[PDB]
Structure 1
Amino acid sequence: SGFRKMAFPSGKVEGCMVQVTCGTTTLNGLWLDDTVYCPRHVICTAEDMLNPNYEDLLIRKSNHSFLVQAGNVQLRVIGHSMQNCLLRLKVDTSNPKTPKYKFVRIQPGQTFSVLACYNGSPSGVYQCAMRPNHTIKGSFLNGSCGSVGFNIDYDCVSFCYMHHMELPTGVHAGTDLEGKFYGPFVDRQTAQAAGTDTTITLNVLAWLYAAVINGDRWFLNRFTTTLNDFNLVAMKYNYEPLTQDHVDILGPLSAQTGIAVLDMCAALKELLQNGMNGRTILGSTILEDEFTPFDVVRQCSGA
C-alpha cells in the first residue's frame, strides 16, 4: 500500500556523470562509451552568450581547452564536435560503467527522473513531468547544466533530457540527447518566456485510478458524461482535451478497478466544479498531474 512520487534508482546514471570545464566554466557531462555529452554553452564567455556563433566559437577551441574529470580521474579529450545544442567530446577511455541505453525524445505529459548534479557529483534525484509548454518544474541551481533526465526499463536507461537553462519564471528548459531543445527555446540571451501551460488531463485521471486502488473512493458518483461534454468542462478549467487515444490508454486501470473511463471523467468533472468539500485524495487537496497511467501501474504493481 501507499502511493508516492517515486524516481528510478539513479546508480546506473551516477556511473556516467563527469565534470566538464572550459576556462572558468564548469558544468556536468554524460559519459557513455568513449563520448562525453554536455551543453554547448560550456564553450561561451558571458559576452558570447549574447550572440553566440557556436560553429565559429567551437573552431577556435582545442581538445586541450576541455578538462574532463570522472570522479578524481582525468579523461583526456581526443576530439570535439557539435550536435545541435550539445558538444560531443570524444575521450581516450570508454566508460566501463556504461549501462545498456537508448536516447529517446519524450512527449509532453510524460514523466522522468532527474539526477541533479554539480561539479560532476550527483546531489539529488526527483521525478518530473514534461509540461505541455515544454518546460519542467525542476529544482536546479547554477552549476546544474548537463544534469540529465531518464527512465529505466529492465536495466536499460532511456536518457530523455539534458539540462541547459532556467527561464525568468523559474522553470527549466533543455534538450533531448540529440541536442534538440524541447520547446521554442534557444541557448542564448533573449527575452524568451515559457508559454501558458495546461493541466495534464490524462495524468489526473491516472492518479484518480491510483487513489481508488489505494482505497480512496469518495469522489466516485452515479453521474455519466460524454467526451464532448467533459471537454467543455476541461476547457473552462484549463485542462487538456481528453482524446480517444487517452481513453484507450486508461483501459487497463479501468478494467482493474471496474470504473469506466467516462465514469471517472464524471468524477473529475464534479471535482473540478465543486471542490473536495474538506476531503483529501491520497493526502492531496490538489488534483495531481505528474503521474502517468504507466507510473500508476508500475508502482501499484500486480497482486
Structure 2
Amino acid sequence: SGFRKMAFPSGKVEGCMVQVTCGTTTLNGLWLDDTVYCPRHVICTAEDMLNPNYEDLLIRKSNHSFLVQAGNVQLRVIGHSMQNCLLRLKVDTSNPKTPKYKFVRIQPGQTFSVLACYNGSPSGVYQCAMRPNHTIKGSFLNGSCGSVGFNIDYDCVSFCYMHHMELPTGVHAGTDLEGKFYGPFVDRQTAQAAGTDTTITLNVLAWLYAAVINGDRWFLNRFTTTLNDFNLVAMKYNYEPLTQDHVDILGPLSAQTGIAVLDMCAALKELLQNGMNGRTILGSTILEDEFTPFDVVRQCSGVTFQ
C-alpha cells in the first residue's frame, strides 16, 4: 500500500541526452537514431530574443555553427532544418542507446515524467500534469532548456514535452517533439501570461477512488447527484465540468470499489461545500488533481482493502 507521485524509471531517456552549443548559447538536446532535437532559440544571442526572425537567423548558420557533445564525444553535424520551434540536427553517428519510441502530443490533464537536465547531464526526475491552461508546474533553472517529458508503456518511450520557457508566475511552457507549443505561447523574450487555470475534476475523482482502494471510506455519504447539479457546484469552485465520457473513464475504478461515479461526485460536492474538517485523504489535506485514472490503476493494488 501507500500512494506517491511516481515518475517512470528514467534510464532509457538518460542515454539520449546531449549538449548543443551555438555561439555563446548552450542547452540540452535529444539524440534518437541520427537526429538531435533541440529548442530553436539555441541559435539566438541576447540581442536576438526580444524579436527574433528564426528563418532569417537560421539561414545565416552552417552545419558547423553547431557543436553536439554526447558525454566526452563530439558528434559531427551534417544537416540542419527547423521544424516549428525545434531544430533537427542530422549527425554522423546513430545513437546506439536509442530506445523504442514515439512522439505524442499529450492532452490537458494528462501526466508525464520530466528528466531535468543541465549541460546534457541528467540531474533529476519528477512527475507533473499538463495543466488546463497549458502550463506545467516544474522545477527548472538556467540551462534546463531541451529537458524532455515522457511516458513509458511496455518498453516504448513516448516523448511528449521539450522545455523552452518560464513564465512570470514561475510555471513552465514548451512544445511537443514536432515543435508545436502547448498553449498560446511563443518563443520570444516578451511578456506572456498563463491563462487562468482550473482544477482537473476527473483526476480528483480518480484519486478519491485510490483512497478507497487503499481502504479509506470516511468522506463517502448516502447521497447521489445528477451531472448537472454536480456541474453547478463545480463552476463555483473553479473545477472543470464533468462529462459523460469522464464518467465512463471512471468505470473500472467504480467497479473495483463498488462505488458509482455519481455517488463519488456527491462525496466530492460535499467535500467542496463543507471542507475536510481537519482530516486527510491519502495523507493530503488538499484535494489532489495530478493523478489520472490510469496513474491510479497502475500504482494501486488490483484488490480493494474492503
Distance 1:46 1:118 in 2: 19
Q: Deviations over 1:166-200 (max 9, x none)?
A: 00100000000000000000000221100000000
CA distance in structure 2 between the partners assigned to 1:92 and 1:298 by the alignment = 40
Q: Match of 1:271, SS?
A: helix
Q: Given the superposition, is the C-alpha separation of residues 58 and 301 from structure 1 closer, same or farther in structure 2, using an over 3 Å criterion?
A: farther
- TM-score norm. by structure 2 comes to 0.98
Q: Distance in 2 between matches of 1:216 and 1:199?
A: 23
Cα drift, residue 75 of structure 1: 0.5
Deviation at 1:80, TM superposition (A): 0.8
1:99-135 CA-partner distances (Å, limit 9, x unpaired): 0000000000000000000000000000000000000
Change (3 A) 1:301 1:32: farther
Q: What's the offset of the Cα at 1:24? A: 1.2
- Measure how far apart 1:97 and its partner are: 0.5
Counterpart in the other structure of 1:244: 244
Q: Unmatched 5+ residue regions in structure 1?
A: none
1:278 is displaced (CA, Å) by 1.4
Query: How far apart in 1 are the matches of 2:216 and 2:278?
Result: 14
Which residue in the other structure is 1:140 paired with? 140
Q: Distance in 2 between matches of 1:273 and 1:72?
A: 58
CA distance in 1, matches of 2:107, 2:131: 9
Distance 1:196 1:288 in 2: 18
Partner deviation per Cα, 1:269-300 (whole Å, 9 max, x = no partner): 01000111111001100000000000000011
Looking at structure 1, the residues matched to 96 and 300 of structure 2 have their Cα atoms a distance apart, in angstroms, of: 34
Query: For 2:60 and 2:70, how far apart are their aligned partners in 1?
Result: 25
* Cα deviation 1:123-164 (Å, max 9, x = unaligned): 000000000000000000010000000000000000000000
Q: Return the alpha-carbon distance in structure 2 between the equivalents of residues 166 and 214 of structure 1.
A: 37
* Structure 1 residue 260, shift from structure 2 partner: 0.2
Residue of structure 1 equivalent to 2:290: 290
Give the CA RMSD over aligned residues. Answer: 0.6
Runs (4+) of structure 1 exceeding 3 A deviation are none
Identity of aligned residues (%): 100
Instruction: Tell me how far apart the structure 1 counterparts of residues 91 and 54 of structure 2 sit (CA, whole Å).
Output: 21
Cα distance between partner residues in 1 of 2:169 and 2:77: 36
Task: After TM superposition, give the deviation of residue 301 of structure 1 in Å.
Answer: 4.5
Q: CA deviation at 1:56?
A: 1.1
The 8 Å contact of residues 213 and 301 in structure 2, kept in 1 or not, is answered as no
Contact 2:132 2:197 in 1 (8 A): yes
Change beyond 3 A, Cα 1:301–1:142: same
Asked if the contact 2:117/2:124 (under 8 Å) is kept, the reply is yes
The separation in 1 between residues aligned to 2:251 and 2:135, in whole angstroms, is 28
Distance 2:32 2:301 in 1: 31
User: CA separation in 1, counterparts of 2:278 and 2:149?
Assistant: 36
Aligned length: 302
**Paired residue for 1:169?**
169
- What is the rounded CA distance, in whole Å, between the counterparts of 1:115 and 1:301 in structure 2? 27
| TM-score normalised by L of structure 1 | 0.99
Verify the 8 A CA contact 2:78 2:91 in the aligned structure 1.
yes
Q: Distance in 2 between matches of 1:86 and 1:79?
A: 14
2-side partners of 1:106 and 1:271: how far apart?
30
Partners in 2 of 1:270 and 1:170 — Cα distance? Answer: 32
CA shift at 1:67, angstroms?
Answer: 0.9
